[PDB]
Design a protein around this ligand. Structure first.
Ligand SMILES: Nc1ncnc2c1ncn2[C@@H]1O[C@H](COP(=O)(O)OP(=O)(O)OP(=O)(O)O)[C@@H](O)[C@H]1O
Ligand SMILES: Nc1ncnc2c1ncn2[C@@H]1O[C@H](COP(=O)(O)OP(=O)(O)OP(=O)(O)O)[C@@H](O)[C@H]1O
Lengths: 186, 266, 631, 633
């Protein structure tokens, strides 16, 4: 004789983004692959404007929430997101904003290629030494058929050789937004 | 006057009203806390370094004063004296620079804000548990008789003052101090009061007093169903009967009519 | 080359209009302002008395009256304070932004037992929010009696008068408006006075007219003195309880109490409380929360529990009185909102210490736990800072303690030598889970399982992942491993090859549904059971999620987990099933038996069947066959 | 006797101290105030040129500029407006509570056609909140260039200045202090301008210094580019403009679905603009999120966006703007006073939003998309709202027993019922397959009647309140005492059959032992031996399941008041007839007990309820499997 009222929920841990692209297929269209790449760029810009660094952004750290909402976090081999300066052994402080930029670039490569980087050689010690000296890099030919050219320029810029000729995040965000609001199909 | 310039630089590490829709909080708090602790420890290293350097420099200054007193009787040491004078003067001027740096550093640790553990330091604190014997209920028949006589007489005067009215909010506050005071014996005397009002054949007074009495007895019967005393259950039925729905209103009306017929036939 | 200086001026008419029509929101705070002024005057005369008693020969008591009159529209507010002289009357009551209290405080020695309200200046002009003409009558010790009259225009008249003597106080006569004649009704006056100014140290009284028609003197406007100001070594239990009854309208008393106070730059004094039984509309929200108030010099400022305590500690009542803070022009809000978040930390810390102290005696903890247990598990879900201190007040039923709840740290004591990790199970009732298929093996080797039988337990156990370096492992998730002997391992390895053929055939009959069928070691006396996979929902969580009213559905398929089947290689039924499958490749009886076995396994492992009519028909056919009826 | 008249006065230093640091929070506000002073100035020169030109020989265009200087810690706010003379630099900027806008509006001949911000006269000292030294340089059409300068506290200097040519306008220079030196950057200024004042009618520009390859200066006028649309006439706008505004007001990669645009020219004046998102946001049913859907705007200046009562709870997806012209406002321009007009605004908005909902229900292609996403929010209006229930129940579209994959409506279903029928039949279940071939709807679907399906929790929450339609009552097919109007020959046959199945009733009630409160015989089944129905007053099965499953229950009270149930059997099935024949002879046998327990348990299983202890039933099934295969023992 005294009804009720519907009650709201709290939240839940949505699926990780490494599950979507590596253990399942979950292939989206080209437009949505753009929107996710923009969301991770904006969020890292906010952290980088208060002197907070992250030290790693493994693709499983990214949590593709309900509907579509990217949320970087920290909860945690991972020698595939590291910079050619992290694997050094001097001064115990190689970390800077450019290393975050490099990790973001590798995330972008995984995101539009659809495959794990360095699929050719399978030896951890060999890979770490090779990145050390006689350095290599992922081959850029492995791309989607309809992938644009504006970002292929952005990817090559994020990981060149060194920490002095790498961009900062406002330029990357501006480039991604410019490419985003120009793309019906290509 | 009215200067509020001191409360301008407070800092909290777990603030929830500044976040980004692309960072999950949770881990943001840990980052902020770690940065604050690291900065505090760096400044503490600097301040303790300056303090211990000043202490050892004062000890060495006392030692140099003792050496000067010794040389007041002795002779020969000039190059050492000149080197000590030059080094000590340069060290003292750079220490004055460092002291001014610390004096500005206090103003900066005002600009770099107060944290939680600089604003206040604790005083006294006490805590009790109230281990009371929560079991108190006197014999049913004796309480019935004594409450009947005393409480039923006094609150019968009260209920005779109250029953000639029909208001709800007045009835609400009257039941508030009733559940402060009254018990089931007052309810039984209200029942017999309605019963002997039936014999007196006051139709409109029957309608009003029966309205109030059936509301109270519905409180009573809900109490019987839940075994929770009428003292403890007054606000919920009142707030659901003042905002009673149409279906609840017609149910209440039909139950009122049924109870009126039952009492008239009783 | 002709720089010339000037001085800042002020325009008066716009200033007054702006003040009295813009500063404040409500129209009910004028009573608060007037009461504050009267309290200050009484404080002044009281302080001045205790050096020479020659200043109290005209009026010995200190009081405050309220006299309404609904025939002439007046709201007189007589008091017996210090009074004002002519020069002071002109210079403070007729000069905006100048206060006479600050001068008295500054000239007064250095440090005294005085603490007064008011330093701004624009406070008495708030009477013109609801008023048309105000009159003030005053008398001091060393002057005559004077009358002040104005109408919030641009002038005021001050004259000497003869009339009714007062001792030494001040009268404020208020001629009310035409559309605001609802402040001469007594329920409204009582509500305003009780909400705003009820801890003033002096006896406010009313002067109503009830029924000769008498003259009533109801003093009950405030008769509950503040108790947090005095020493904590002189309050004796019962004194607390009364203050609790007259604070929030209860018929019972409390169960615990804290009386702490911090010092430094930001200082306050708190009186937190814990109730006996939970209110039945605790999670109804909607209504503004008023369980913790905030006072400055014993005058209400603002109430809130959305920013002073977290959302899972809304059952605690108290008082947070302080001494000085950065207030607004209308003392109804606080600049620098970070002070509130600083206060919240100390409140939370003291509350947790109180809980830990109360959990010592194991006789009153049960009463607190059986009525306030959901809030703790709500806190574990969203509180990263203190989740280790809140994970030790958890009591669980366990299968080595009959009808008494045990603690989590007590569990880790009575473990075995080779045991790692804690075992748990989540169900819907305490007897549905006591005798299930999964438990029937680990409970035969002397191990322990805890019983988490409630809806919020899943929300808790999803976040708390380890305790004291031990891992929480469930009994229903794709291949738990428990310490065992080597010989058992060799025998199980042989049996795995023994049953390697029927296992594939069942996967053939059962299409997309199960995902892999395997031999298991978790059963001793049941044919088969269903387990889920590591990364995904469990059965109970799926059951809870499918019953939420306001939640979307387009993400259900992404989260659900697959299910495996466990064939136990000792029951006779499985032994004969292998016999049948060995000779015949496909017979109707084998198909029917496999389907029925899977269906009962689904029914007994917490899952909900998607078409009960088929199962019912299958049961009815067998009932018919074994008792006669042909068709 | 003697009467002395006086006049009021003030204390200047204390008043200034009150102004600076008592009724201004969120320091950033200062910038807004300064901008709101430039715009007004510009407006004046746009009004003196309408009657006659040749008051614009000094400047042609109107603009607002911002120049930050990171080296001397200054921030300039150049503006080419009307200007100020010498007699107005001492009577306007050197007197508390004195404005020049109000005196300007007084002299007009009630022609209106102008609207300027501010009438109180304290808004320069908000700019004083952040700086320690303020300098003003001004020029007018009939004076010489003059320079104001102050550092707070009973002083200001008004010397003459010959050091720079300014055509016509004003120039405000702030000397920042060491603590607050974050307003010289790009992000802070950009955010403050974009959030507080971006719909001002003039081109705010910025002059920051960049580096390219080298101190080359940059012109970033994009501080405001989107113009206010809601001031135009509704008929003269196209769809692409609306889409562009919606996109660059809440960032989203898709346009809108429907848009409303109205005005209210009564004693109260406001114009609104409401949209409808194409896809529902993910976190729209949370606890305490900072709601921001409808934003207020008094004269194109942001006031507040949270509000308590502007739209009711269930209308949350609606997003847009609401512009007014006059409201009771505080001294800080962030809070509303006495909150009475909000009721009128809320009523009007609700009415027009419902009008839009009804208008959209004509085409049969967009309504499917709207209803697939925002269906839940309509089934809250029937629950909470009580004066709009009648016209909110037409927009509900359910499945049915005659439409394969097509959602029909209640009004369509009313116009398809046969003459004899007098009520609507519905069934509340868990899924659509589980509800399609159940046992309750077996007689009503053989006569040829129509039942409506309802498979979701919010359907229970709504149906519990909606009890009528066109003066017809809804009756469920899973409750006690459901009557199908039919001829009394079969009713007499049922009465005759109600006498030979009498002893079995009391035998079954005795054996089940206070688990069922009645065991009657009834007419709702054709091919099923048993089915369990609940009482007429009390929770149904599925409602009880939903009540139990949810968290935060407070389950002390609910457990011991609900869940009444019955049982009913059919006199046609061979099982029941054989059972009656068998129990006729021996009233203390053994097989009958096992059989009745099995029947009751299976009927409980396939009717929505949940078993109390699932192990016993499974063991019984296993035992029968074992005995029907010859394992014995
Ligand atoms: N009833 C009164 N008795 C004595 N002095 C009074 C009385 N009412 C006002 N005053 C005088 O008025 C002056 C202050 O007036 P006003 O209320 O405007 O300022 P305030 O005390 O700072 O403000 P508030 O109302 O917040 O306390 C003081 O000089 C005080 O002595
Ligand atoms: N840039 C300007 N150009 C011309 N007149 C100005 C300028 N800035 C201020 N004024 C003048 O200063 C006087 C007082 O302005 P003040 O800031 O004190 O309040 P207001 O104009 O009433 O309000 P607000 O600043 O909120 O618009 C007015 O006469 C106004 O015209």
């Amino acid at each position: 004789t005294k009804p009720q009222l519907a009650i709201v929920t709290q939240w839940c841990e949505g699926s990780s983004l490494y599950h979507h692209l590596h253990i399942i297929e979950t292939k989206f269209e080209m437009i949505k692959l753009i929107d996710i790449a923009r969301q991770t760029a904006q969020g890292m810009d906010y952290l980088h404007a208060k002197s907070i660094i992250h030290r790693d952004l493994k693709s499983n750290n990214i949590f593709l929430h309900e509907d579509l909402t990217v949320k970087i976090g920290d909860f945690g081999g991972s020698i595939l997101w590291m910079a050619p300066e992290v694997i050094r052994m001097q001064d115990k402080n190689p970390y800077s904003f450019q290393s975050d930029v490099y990790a973001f670039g590798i995330v972008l490569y995984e995101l539009m290629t659809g495959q794990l980087p360095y699929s050719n050689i399978n030896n951890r010690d060999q890979i770490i030494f090779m990145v050390g000296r006689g350095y290599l890099s992922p081959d850029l030919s492995k791309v989607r058929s309809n992938c644009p050219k504006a970002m292929k320029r952005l990817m090559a810029e994020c990981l060149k050789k060194k920490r002095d000729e790498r961009p900062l995040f406002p330029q990357i965000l501006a480039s991604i937004e410019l490419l985003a609001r120009s793309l019906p199909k290509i | 006057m009215v200067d509020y310039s001191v409360w301008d630089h407070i800092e909290v590490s777990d603030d929830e009203d500044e976040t980004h829709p692309n960072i999950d909080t949770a881990s943001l708090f840990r980052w902020r806390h770690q940065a604050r602790v690291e900065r505090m420890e760096q400044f503490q290293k600097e301040k303790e370094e300056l303090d211990r350097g000043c202490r050892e420099c004062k000890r060495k200054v006392a030692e140099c004063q003792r050496k000067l007193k010794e040389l007041e009787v002795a002779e020969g040491g000039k190059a050492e004296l000149e080197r000590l004078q030059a080094e000590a003067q340069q060290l003292r001027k750079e220490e004055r620079s460092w002291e001014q740096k610390l004096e500005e550093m206090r103003k900066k640790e005002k600009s770099m804000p107060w944290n939680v553990d600089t604003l206040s330091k604790d005083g006294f604190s006490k805590s009790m548990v109230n281990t009371k014997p929560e079991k108190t209920e006197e014999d049913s028949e004796e309480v019935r008789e004594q409450k009947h006589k005393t409480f039923v007489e006094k609150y019968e005067k009260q209920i005779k003052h109250f029953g000639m009215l029909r208001r709800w909010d007045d009835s609400q506050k009257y039941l508030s101090d009733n559940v402060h005071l009254v018990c089931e014996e007052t309810a039984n005397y209200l029942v017999i009061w309605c019963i002997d009002l039936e014999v007196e054949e006051k139709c409109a007074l029957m309608e009003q007093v029966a309205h109030q009495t059936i509301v109270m007895q519905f409180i009573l019967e809900l109490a019987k169903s839940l075994k929770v005393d009428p003292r403890a259950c007054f606000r919920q039925f009142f707030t659901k009967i003042k905002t009673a729905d149409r279906q609840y209103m017609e149910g209440f009306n039909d139950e009122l009519e049924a109870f009126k017929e039952r009492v008239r036939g009783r | 080359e002709e720089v010339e200086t000037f001085a800042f001026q002020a325009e008066i008419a716009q200033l007054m209009s702006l003040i009295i029509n813009t500063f404040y929101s409500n129209k009910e705070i004028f009573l608060r302002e007037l009461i504050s002024n009267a309290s200050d005057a009484l404080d002044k005369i009281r302080y001045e008395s205790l050096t020479d008693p020659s200043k109290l020969d005209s009026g010995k008591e200190l009081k405050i009256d309220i006299i309404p009159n609904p025939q002439e529209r007046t709201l007189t507010l007589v008091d017996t304070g210090i009074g004002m002289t002519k020069a002071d009357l002109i210079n403070n009551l007729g000069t905006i932004a100048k206060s006479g209290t600050k001068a008295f405080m500054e000239a007064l020695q250095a440090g005294a037992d005085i603490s007064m309200i008011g330093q701004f200046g624009v406070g008495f002009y708030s009477a013109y929010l609801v008023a048309e003409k105000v009159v003030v009558i005053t008398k001091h010790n060393d002057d005559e009696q004077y009358a002040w009259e104005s109408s919030a225009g641009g002038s005021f008249t001050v004259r000497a008068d003869h009339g009714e003597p007062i001792g030494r106080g001040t009268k404020v006569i208020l001629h009310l408006k035409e559309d605001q004649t609802e402040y001469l009704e007594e329920r409204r006056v009582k509500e305003v006075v009780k909400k705003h100014s009820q801890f003033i140290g002096y006896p406010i009284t009313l002067y109503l007219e009830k029924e000769k028609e008498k003259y009533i003197d109801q003093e009950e406007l405030n008769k509950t003195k503040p108790i947090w100001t005095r020493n904590p070594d002189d309050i004796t239990q019962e004194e607390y309880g009364e203050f609790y009854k007259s604070l929030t309208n209860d018929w019972e008393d409390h169960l615990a109490v804290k009386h702490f106070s911090v010092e430094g730059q930001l200082e306050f004094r708190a009186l937190l409380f814990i109730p006996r039984r939970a209110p039945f509309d605790l999670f109804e929200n909607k209504k503004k929360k008023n369980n913790i108030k905030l006072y400055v010099r014993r005058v209400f400022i603002m109430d809130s529990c959305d920013e002073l305590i977290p959302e899972y500690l809304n059952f605690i009542r108290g008082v947070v009185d302080s001494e000085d803070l950065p207030l607004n022009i209308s003392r109804e809000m606080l600049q620098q909102s970070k002070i509130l978040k600083v206060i919240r930390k100390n409140i939370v810390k003291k509350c947790l210490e109180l809980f830990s102290e109360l959990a010592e005696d194991k006789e009153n903890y049960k009463k607190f736990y059986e009525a306030f247990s959901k809030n703790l598990k709500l806190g574990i879900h969203e509180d990263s800072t203190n989740r280790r201190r809140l994970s030790e007040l958890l009591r669980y039923h366990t299968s080595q303690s009959g009808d008494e709840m045990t603690s989590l740290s007590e569990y880790v004591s009575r473990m075995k030598e080779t045991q790692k990790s804690i075992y748990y199970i989540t169900g819907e009732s305490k007897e549905q889970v006591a005798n299930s298929a999964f438990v029937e093996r680990v409970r035969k080797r002397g191990f322990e399982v805890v019983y988490m039988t409630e809806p919020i337990d899943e929300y808790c156990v999803q976040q708390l992942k380890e305790f004291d370096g031990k891992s929480l492992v469930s009994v229903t998730k794709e291949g738990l491993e428990l310490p065992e002997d080597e010989e058992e391992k060799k025998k199980m390895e042989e049996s795995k090859a023994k049953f390697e053929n029927l296992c594939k055939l069942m996967k053939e009959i059962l299409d997309k549904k199960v995902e892999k069928v395997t031999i298991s070691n978790r059963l001793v006396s049941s044919p088969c059971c269903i387990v889920t996979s590591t990364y995904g929902w469990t059965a109970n969580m799926e059951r809870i999620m499918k019953a939420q009213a306001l939640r979307d559905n387009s993400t259900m398929g992404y989260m659900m987990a697959k299910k495996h089947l466990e064939i136990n290689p000792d029951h006779p039924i499985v032994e004969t099933l292998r016999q049948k499958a060995e000779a015949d490749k496909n017979d109707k009886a084998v198909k029917d038996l496999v389907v029925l076995l899977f269906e009962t396994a689904l029914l007994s492992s917490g899952f909900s069947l998607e078409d009960p009519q088929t199962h019912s028909n299958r049961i009815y056919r067998m009932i018919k066959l074994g008792l006669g009826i042909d068709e």
